[model samples]
Target: PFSNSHNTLKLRFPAEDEFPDLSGHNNHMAKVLTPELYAELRAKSTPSGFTVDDVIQTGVDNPGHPYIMTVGCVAGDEESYDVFKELFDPIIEDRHGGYKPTDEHKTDLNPDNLQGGDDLDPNYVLSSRVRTGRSIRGFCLPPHCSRGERRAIEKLAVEALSSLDGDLAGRYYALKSMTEAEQQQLIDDHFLFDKPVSPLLLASGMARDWPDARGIWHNDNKTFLVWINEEDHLRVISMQKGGNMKEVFTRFCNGLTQIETLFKSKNYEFMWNPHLGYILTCPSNLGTGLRAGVHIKLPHLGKHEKFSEVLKRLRLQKRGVGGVFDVSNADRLGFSEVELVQMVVDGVKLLIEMEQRLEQGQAIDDLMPAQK
Candidate 1:
């Protein structure tokens, strides 16, 4: 019987899953990549089907997403999950940092509690963005995600974006029809979702009909945006210029609520696991999959050798400020959405204080050198 009583409970088999993952011809790409445990997963059809495009195709497509490679092998299958956890423990757990996924999806959505730097400060905060990855439970994941399924999900997203009635309402742009200038604007604005992955994926069997199911939807302000058929089935995002976390978080919450409601209207559901609050093609995002961060200038922190230690203590990760040197929480799976958000909020505030004191020629060896 179909009931919300249990997520796994169902009536008619989902059409997305109706098409079976074939065997014998390059099945289970992750297994192919690893080989040792391939035997166990291949021995049976896990929830996602060992032969499914995502499982085989991702391994077939690129090097395979690091997180997806591990999770892909065992699509909600108990044994597959257990074995994967056991085998990849070193990289995924130990070396990769212990991935403690839990229900950290809650948030107060209150800006009063937000911590941020001032825009007027010489060491200014440029812009901030918080994004999360999502996949419809019934649709094919990217690796196994089919061309028709791509079109299906893309169409569904466009419809949802149309339902927005507030500042959230905006336009949808398909990559296929995008002019060169328009496409460049997306990249410049950091609103696009195309990123390179391991070639192992292509060699295995994904991106066959590439770019067909891809597109981006944004509100009139370009603040609320969604990338369809990119890394995950959907990459829902909300961002704005400057250090005001309140506005960015509020808009993000609004967009997420609307999108979740829209999907529910169609009986479509985002992927969820007992362990992962919201699963993604990447394991790093298995739990909440929420990335809350700001792009702020840290001339002082950037110079200090101990900056890495500060991030380690904060449980955050840094990319370049433009992703080349910017910082964001790297431990989403282990912490709840609020904890991660607060983690960044508090960390950013601390960094700002250090920067201010550094400007006054103060010693940071106390803060930065405090090794974890």
Candidate 2:
């Protein structure tokens, strides 16, 4: 099934004397693709037609990135990782904070084991969201999927989504036919994904046949959603307008589990391996493929000199405009899904506490957590 996903591009690797200039860049691709290493693997290609150039195309084109690894998978298959392990191993370890080849990824979805997320001070948290990407085993990943394969995935997604009951029930909205008003509304509400514009994504060929089979499905209340034919075959999301991590997590677990069951009923399996819990096109999202976070308003702490330092201490990241930051865990691999989310929950709570203390003109040095 993987061998015939797409027509192979018959380009030749650059000759050693004519190799593109990568001396100015410092990304993993540049670091690992030394002339010596490039010579060793440049001639080889994955069974599905992914070449060494495909793996490093993103980094080569966009030289300003801090780190870009495996921008796209041409074979649309996970074997690309195995076939290019020589280059992938070092890049994966460096990008994922030293995740070793021998290390196995563990998953714990039982929200019951989560601690201290039941309640949060509403003044700080505006919303909570937990999402993960999944790819059906047989089809190629997004970077290499054919139009027919994409349509097949969309068909399967909508069919499985229809089986969801209770709060999980929702309607699918194909981007192809979605009205401009509704599309604009979804974008304003941050419910819809925009077309790919990144140099890396574009170079990876992810935008081919754009918006044809791409779409979104969300429940009536919008707390649960799935993105089909975007970055992955299915990007399951569970969210709500509050900081009830436990509640939001429970819903996420329920929605993802139901979808998995439906896919399994059709004999479809998500691409997963012991070494990489869930394989997505990007190696950075290899394990769990989860990003659980909250839209937090940290007015005082957001400006504090120790803000970035404190977030790093807690293994959390902040992204935003205004004082409201979308804070989530910084580590994705080397941890269970529940553990990763728990990191965010506990870290957010502490951050809120620190914010309150700052509001009271108190020092936060004493509130900083110990290093992980």
Candidate 3:
């Protein structure tokens, strides 16, 4: 039988010039961060006795931590369902905080936010809207996501809206509660069959205890995945604990890797979808798979030009290809790619090595032998 499964290849580039050059100031961009800003942030936050290194390391250490490290998934067809399940279930169970409905009132549609060609107006959509609380759901990217990752993203939106469980299938089941024909209509309208359901649904189900930890899915071309985290609940915890950045970040990364490895190992046969096409859509990112990153609030680093300049310079080097996700507002927010990348690499490497040690019964942290 022809199997509709695929393996993911993750490739990370050192902060080389092959990325993009984000140096000069433009309407759409801003400068990077500096050491002075970092110092100022450290002073303002007065994050207990923990040094900046501690904060950074803590974030790096907890790659699977729910609030800090986000998780997501994508698949090509029903055959790849097992693969998605294997990779996603563990993350949800171990790292995700949980899922819940949004307390804020969501507009049915906002005309101001609509694209030029969109026929449906936000007013009309809102007029016929059902009153469901705002919740964080999955995101979908375009199949050929390179430059037009939005295309695949739009498809995911349709799928989300048409899902049997409403737009938040990963948590609530609006479809299962409906009649079969109603379900069929939704599937047809949303093109859910154009690809497989996200593993986020499975992950969400597993993380039932953390109602605040939700899975948000998106696709940026051929790659599709979910952003798993506890949005509201964890934020409150972080504040109350006097901002234990290290513990928070460490748990986040560890949780992510755990989930990723679990699915990969168990559903190896089910997760491989060969039908997905490979195309360099993003200019900054040329060849990578299921790319994941953490969104941090680093206000100190955003003050200087050197950091942002370096990123800009890197992007310029790789001008045409859509690869890097630029940080124009880094200076204002104290975001540093160098710091972020280092922490991310360290967290992921540690998780991979740790898993290897347990599985191979080896004293060494290296997993090179298994790769062979």
Winner by TM-score: 2
Model 2: per-residue Cα lDDT over 235-354, one tens digit each: 888888888888999999888888889899999998988897888888778899899899999989988999988888899987875789999888878899889888998898899899
| Better model by TM-score: candidate 2 vs candidate 3 | 2
lDDT of 3 by residue, 1-372 (tens): 332111111112232322233243221101212344333322221111222222222122222422332322222223222333332233323331221121111211222222221121221111111000111112111111122323332333334323422222232122213456745754653412111233333322222332222323322221122332221100101000212223333333333333334434433211212221111111111111112232222222233233234334222111111211212111100112223323333332333343345445554323222210
Question: Against the correct fold, how does model 2 do in TM-score?
Answer: 0.92
Candidates' lDDT values, in order?
A: 0.62, 0.82, 0.25
Q: What TM-score, over all chains together, does every model reach?
A: 0.75, 0.92, 0.21
CA-only RMSD, every prediction: 8.3, 3.0, 25.3
Order the candidate numbers by TM-score, best to worst.
2, 1, 3
Alpha carbon lDDT at 295, candidate 3: 25
Writing each residue's lDDT as its tens digit, candidate 1 over 140-164 gives 5665666787899888888888889
Worst 10 residues of 2 by lDDT: 4-13
Whichever of 2 and 3 has more lDDT, that candidate is 2
